[model samples]
Target: MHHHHNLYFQSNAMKTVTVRDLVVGEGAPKIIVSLMGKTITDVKSEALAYREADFDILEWRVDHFANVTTAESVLEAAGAIREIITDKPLLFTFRSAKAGGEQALTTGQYIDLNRAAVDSGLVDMIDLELFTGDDEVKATVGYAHQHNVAVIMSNHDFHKTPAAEEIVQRLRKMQELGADIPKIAVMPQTKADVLTLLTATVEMQERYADRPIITMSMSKTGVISRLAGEVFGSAATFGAVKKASAPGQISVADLRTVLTILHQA
Candidate 1:
């Protein structure tokens, strides 16, 4: 929500995150195609194919893994995935079961898994769920920074689209929590709801965002935001090649072509 204090503006600061020489948040739409973790071999094979793909980054959606029960097994597979996609920046994510993903870890268990993953140094960025509570977020952020891992503070809404004001609040909270990138993905029920998402995105960047933000009004109807990131001030878009980890994800190749057209090289 644009508060009475909204009249007072913050710096229109846009910071680029240097992840293995891939500077995000100030360029063409960065398409992050996610790997649906089937098995260690299956994930590796999928990542390898993206070596020739035009996407910018790869997200290992760990909740999709069949063996995500232990940090050791996940790290072992992460080592393998890193070896295969040596050139791409990898974002490790274990989406909360409440957000409609697969992983069902309790708060303590979730923190334990991420702490171990960051320490392994296999992932460049760790997706810390914003709903995981303030204490857990800070703990993960602190640990990740010590080990030189970027933190992507993320919030996802699968059931209902929240008000644009609330969505921006969430992003700002992520920034406050010291996230390298603050991200929000919400389900859109109507056309106006999608517009609300876009309006909020533009306003967030123009007024509050210091680093690049990731904001999306999800599904096929809300697909425009994925390609309109530059216009609306979003840094990345998620599309799939082998399989989609979320609703309304376009293919990496097609999404890349469209982004090229929009960003004009």
Candidate 2:
């Protein structure tokens, strides 16, 4: 009876996240391909081409778009992408300049943009930064959940990776703030930094996490973290369609093949 209870508790802690028809955290990490279109025309072309890519989720990096603050243009861009990529879950993200995005936004603008996305009825998920303040983050998370839109609460460190403990804490905080999925992307300055990232992933999932999480160590040196997520405990990985939105993302085809081989093993 005690053993059965332990098993149930463990399973309960690792809640799989389902977005649209895709389910994360049950098998191989789901592949997320980013669409970083600078212009409306570019958005349409990228979506049309990306519809043919082999990936599980679609992320629109609205920070890269020219008219990101304009509600109509943003909705039009989303609508165009939705028209082309109807099957996959659409993840709307505006990575602010603080998080290595192309443009900057006042905190109010950031929250408003995400709230708008939640209300638009076009996206299945939205990426919100973890440092966007506790009150606003919590409220936005509540709002997104009300709309049935999952929020991927994220953090990024472009210069170097933090200690495993710090990483785990950030993810835990995201969970506490009601994020559907907690995500972190950090740059690795040394080989061990990659190990530090993986260590955090394992510790978070094994001891604390009650839901799926996404973790990565960016750049070529840390590419293994992206591919080995199935074993290390991350529930998703990002890939590229034409150009990578981040430093270490590989081609969708290559990412899929490696993930498949690993999953088969």
TM-score list, all predictions: 0.92, 0.94
Q: What is the lDDT for 42 in model 1?
A: 81
Error of 2 at 140 (Å): 0.3
For candidate 1, lDDT tens digit of each residue in 30-139? 88988886788888787777777787788988898988886678988999988888877888998878886886888888888888887787888889999899987987
Shift in Å, residue 220, candidate 1: 0.6
List model 2 lDDT by residue over 129-247, tens digit each. 98899998999998887777888999999999999999999999999998888999999999999999999999998888888999999999999999999999999999988888899
lDDT of each: 0.83, 0.89
Clashing pairs in 2: none
Cα error, residue 112 of model 2, in Å, equals: 0.9
Candidate 1: list runs displaced more than 4 Å: 1-13
Best by TM-score: 2
**RMSD (CA, angstroms), candidate 2:** 6.6
